[PDB]
């Protein structure tokens, strides 16, 4: 009941897909088990490169087809290398790099908590089993990782499980357990970028949108509000030609709705004090003078938001 | 008359593309068929995987090219795995990827009724039957589906059905009956995003574009519709880099319309209320005052756009 | 001098290439010629699928490499299928999936007249000969056609001509006549969202740009058609982020340029109507009320748009 | 010493990459060379078409890997088709489509200058040599080309040359001279959509931007060139959301800082015409008044702008 | 213990990809090892194209899998070409097109520090050693690269090293020693385009920011830094439609910050000169009259930002 070794060497992982949760993972992986003593061409072990592995299966060597369960399609393997030894063993060795799926949560957005996944187990084969689970991580922790779009929390973390698949084949002795590896990395978005050049800008104009209650007349309070609903808009603009659509309101995608509320706010209050009086034309005398009310009726409901 | 049995794991259906009704589904796909008993290695059945296949075929295995009726162009094949038995039956297991094809109406659009497709029949072969049709729905029902773009009715809802082909090959003793499953899975689109950061503010402009009329000065209430018509359109900006193109007019893209409208009813009114009196300049003293008499005569004609 | 049968059902045809003038076809080619009587195993035809016909070729059976004239680079070729019978005859089926080049006038735009096509003659091959032309268009007329992009006039054109080639090969005694099918399908553009959600729109502001003559003061008539300049623009945006880039001004891409006339008209009228008088500040008693004088000479000048 | 003819039928040089200096070529390539005579079934020529080629190769055919220089990676070959005579000679005929690199100047963009080229040298032969070279322009001249991005000189313009590696191969004893055929074909931009639709509003704003000085206070002269700068930049979008990305600055991307500066001009003397007196607020008497003498000194530095 | 030669055509490095840190290069790839003498049909040497090299390492011919060791998945392979002399030794040469990682700051953006690289080393072999390391770069350095994204620094930068495997095969007696070539390249951006049609319009409206200074009434300077953050906010839009997207905030990517301040800046001091005084309504004298004293305090804390 074959014992199977596997070592994954992760390179880098690259460009994470926002819609379709998808993320692409280069790499080296290799698997050793021990077949049946053999002589070796001298008597140092024998390699075998690419092209030619495909020539020794049709001989008659066995070499089981192990996949990433959780890829996508297929992947892009570049160097097949079957080094098989004099007292029997075979050691696997490929460089691939292919596109991975696992869920990923972009509600909170530009402060992301998310982890990274491979999943392998042999396609074929059940009492053949992988021993012992190896992952050595060359990308760099607390580095310059502030050039990258990751930091890494974070080490390797393996897990050899055992699969029960309930509609199965056509023998069932007791064989439907697979055996599968399951590689996690956990990761946490680079919340650079968004804050800067992002956040504190939509913050900036979210501010002196609230230096309307600064006007003097009734009929320039208006006709402000009118030019700023279009700069929300217009910056709802440079939201969407940089940031990565998804399906669900984030972070981000809320403080713009909060845009547009702080003045349909303005609009149903300027329009308010004009029309609440005891006269022809007299601005409510403190009505007008929420002017700095509620900015702290806002950081107020927005320390409501960070409920 | 050959009995065919069908497996088709699904795995995910991701990104429909929506100009030309297609959608990704990945997965396995699996053939039973029991054939001419044959002497296996050991006693216990035989493993092809891959490469090999290709190999029996050429020393005489017939497999039967089954193909997606409704794919395009071509998928994308993972692993190929005969598996054949000493008292004669044959399962192929393949992994799979690939583009489908499937009628789509996006016009009722954040609110979308929607049905995933595959069709698969036998593609050179008559009198080969699909016997019975199974389908394992890996995804998941009322799960975590506010993270995903679809939630799915919904399970597997199967179909093995005849095919009369009237245009067809040269020898038609009755003999155009091809067997072809047919597998639909429901959908309904995640109308979040959609309505909060989307229809949401599309209705608060919309709204505060009838507080033109809460306007004092005629040259105050034109000049003020005028960079409300610049809002409209600059928030139709928004929606083309957010939203998918189609070729005819959503709901949304109708509420789009309504905004032209709204504005385009403002300029008719306010360049009516002007110059319909009985003088030089005296605004007609109750048609300035439809304040809140065409928002109720929007949301009523609006409650004929629910017609 | 080999007569062969040729059989072509269009599945679809989709997205439209705009500037490369390219479209995607998807469906099943077909081609029979009688070769020289053959046993078949049993007596009933012999039936090869994909990976095998290579192999019948290497064994000495002719199959003609047929091409698609007008494809871009190569296609997509799906199920290859050699069915092949006991009195000679032999059928090739293969579904096909390609990219096709062709002439396309887009200038006249949302109203666009277009016609598809493919041209597919013999490889290498002069006096074989393409016998009768059939294509069956699966594809449904007056249907639901308000649903896709295109509706197809229309029913499948035919046509094998012959092809002189000048400069050719080394061997001329009167050898230069290939045998090309051509077939046509013609198409018209579903004008839908491009009048209610985009002509229109054009309209209601191209329309409302004119009540900048029912202002009053000078001073006002001015700074109003400026941000009636940035209006324009900004929907010209709205145009580039929508509608499909090309080398020739469209229909639409003229509307546009109307726009920027009809003020650029007001800005050389309403500047004129201030200093054309007999004193300080007297502006012109008529010109000043070309308020709806000059819109009748836009619908007239845009009816000189419809010469 | 061998020769080897050369024809290279152009079918269609189309989409341009205009940051990486990348266009795609496609059609047909063809080689005669004469071989040591053979026995030909039959005794007219014999064709080999596409998979055939290779096992000729094997049982010891010689043909010449010939090589684009300036392909982009690798092309697109289609059908390949070697057809060779009882006298020996042999003819290779290939359909191909590829990308080609070369040097291309944008700068002077919306009228530009261009030239398309192939080459083609042997990849491993030295002498071996390229005997004539002929190149057939299916696509044509003065013609319909107003659909067409581009016109065409010109006709094609040959030059078959020879190569000296310098840092070479391990055998030199006089042996480092490549025969290449280098083929080039002229063309020009059709400056259409860029003028109509692109040159003239620009100018018809950049135009209607000096009628800022036809504006009477001054809080009226600053305020409105506010709402002007706005339209430039605003304008510079419509720019990028539909012209080719360069790393130089362009004509057109030129005409747009004239826009910034003409504005800029605007600012720097309206807001000097209120503060060069000799009281308190008087309005320089002239310099308010060069109300049409700037722009022809705009016309005038925008002929120094045509230096 | 095996001597290998390498040779290393660049043709050209052509487009950066700026989030994946990415660049593809195009050339020749040369390697030559001497191996037992062999008798060469004639006696020069004998040369083996493409297809037919597989074929000699079936019949067994050693020929070592070199990996670029930082490519990105695989890479494209145009001419395989084996060169075998009579005295042994072995020449191989092959075209390619890769894919190519290395770490890269694109912090001081428009003026940037750059360098490329390629690193090769066996693949499967540990004692067989890269002798002696060439690279031939075509691309011309003070040339017309002002047609072109980058400058070369710069001439092709080698360095031959040894690498240890720590966790490691199966075989320690010492030995985890491969042996890479590493070729470095150094780089800088074309500062042109960024500063002419980018740096500077940005502060000429950072510049004409400041003339909300120079307004008379308080009501208009403030009404007037509105569509002054409208205008701040719709350049960042001309940002993202051109910049290429990062992770971090550039230099570009500051000065827009930098607008949003001196915006934000102007409403919290004219905002404050209205109501920092001794009654009711009276400007404060000096404060309003800053109109030249914070731009020396922007260029003052912008040479700050040059800190």
Same mark, same amino acid.
């Given at each position: 009941?074959?014992?199977?070794?596997?070592?994954?060497?992760?390179?880098?992982? !690259?460009?994470?897909?926002?819609?379709?949760?998808?993320?692409?993972?280069?790499?080296? %992986?290799?698997? +050793? $088990?021990?077949?049946?003593?053999?002589?070796?061409?001298?008597?140092?072990?024998?390699?075998?490169?690419?092209?030619?592995?495909?020539?020794? %299966?049709?001989?008659? /060597? $066995?070499?089981?087809?192990?996949?990433?369960?959780?890829?996508?399609?297929?992947?892009?393997?570049?160097?097949?290398?079957? &080094?098989?030894?004099?007292?029997?063993?075979?050691?696997?060795?490929?460089?691939?790099?292919?596109?991975?799926?696992?869920?990923?949560?972009?509600?909170?957005?530009?402060?992301?908590?998310?982890?990274?996944?491979?999943?392998?187990?042999?396609?074929?084969?059940?009492?053949? +089993? /992988?021993?012992?689970?190896?992952?050595?991580?060359?990308?760099?922790? %607390?580095?310059?990782?502030?050039?990258?779009?990751? $930091?890494?929390?974070?080490?390797?973390?393996? =897990?050899?499980?055992?699969?029960? !698949?309930? =509609?199965?084949?056509?023998?069932?002795?007791?064989?439907?357990?697979?055996?599968?590896?399951?590689?996690?990395?956990?990761?946490?978005?680079?919340?650079?970028?968004?804050? $800067?050049?992002?956040?504190?800008?939509?913050?900036?104009?979210?501010?002196?949108?609230?230096?309307?209650?600064?006007?003097?007349?009734?009929?320039?309070?208006?006709?402000?509000?009118?030019?700023? &609903?279009?700069?929300?808009?217009?910056?709802?603009?440079?939201?969407?030609?940089?940031?990565?659509?998804?399906?669900?309101?984030?972070?981000?995608? +809320?403080?713009?709705?909060?845009?547009?509320?702080?003045?349909?706010?303005?609009?149903?209050? %300027?329009?308010?004090? =004009? =029309?609440?009086?005891?006269?022809?034309?007299?601005?409510?005398?403190?009505?007008?003078?929420?002017?700095?009310?509620?900015?702290?009726?806002? /950081?107020?409901?927005?320390?409501?938001?960070?409920?």
């Amino acid at each position: 009941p074959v014992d199977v070794s596997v070592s994954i060497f992760i390179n880098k992982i !690259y460009g994470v897909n926002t819609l379709e949760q998808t993320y692409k993972v280069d790499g080296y %992986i290799v698997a +050793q $088990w021990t077949g049946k003593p053999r002589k070796t061409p001298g008597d140092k072990p024998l390699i075998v490169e690419n092209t030619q592995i495909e020539r020794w %299966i049709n001989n008659g /060597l $066995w070499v089981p087809a192990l996949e990433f369960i959780n890829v996508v399609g297929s992947p892009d393997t570049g160097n097949k290398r079957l &080094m098989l030894f004099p007292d029997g063993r075979v050691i696997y060795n490929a460089r691939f790099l292919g596109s991975f799926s696992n869920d990923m949560d972009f509600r909170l957005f530009p402060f992301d908590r998310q982890q990274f996944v491979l999943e392998l187990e042999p396609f074929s084969y059940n009492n053949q +089993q /992988l021993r012992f689970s190896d992952i050595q991580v060359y990308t760099e922790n %607390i580095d310059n990782e502030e050039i990258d779009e990751w $930091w890494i929390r974070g080490k390797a973390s393996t =897990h050899i499980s055992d699969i029960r !698949y309930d =509609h199965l084949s056509s023998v069932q002795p007791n064989q439907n357990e697979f055996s599968r590896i399951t590689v996690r990395i956990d990761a946490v978005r680079n919340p650079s970028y968004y804050l $800067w050049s992002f956040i504190l800008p939509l913050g900036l104009i979210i501010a002196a949108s609230w230096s309307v209650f600064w006007l003097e007349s009734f009929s320039e309070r208006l006709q402000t509000s009118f030019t700023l &609903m279009a700069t929300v808009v217009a910056y709802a603009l440079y939201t969407s030609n940089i940031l990565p659509r998804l399906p669900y309101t984030t972070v981000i995608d +809320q403080m713009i709705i909060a845009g547009y509320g702080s003045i349909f706010a303005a609009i149903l209050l %300027i329009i308010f004090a =004009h =029309h609440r009086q005891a006269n022809g034309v007299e601005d409510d005398l403190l009505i007008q003078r929420c002017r700095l009310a509620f900015p702290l009726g806002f /950081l107020a409901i927005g320390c409501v938001l960070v409920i």
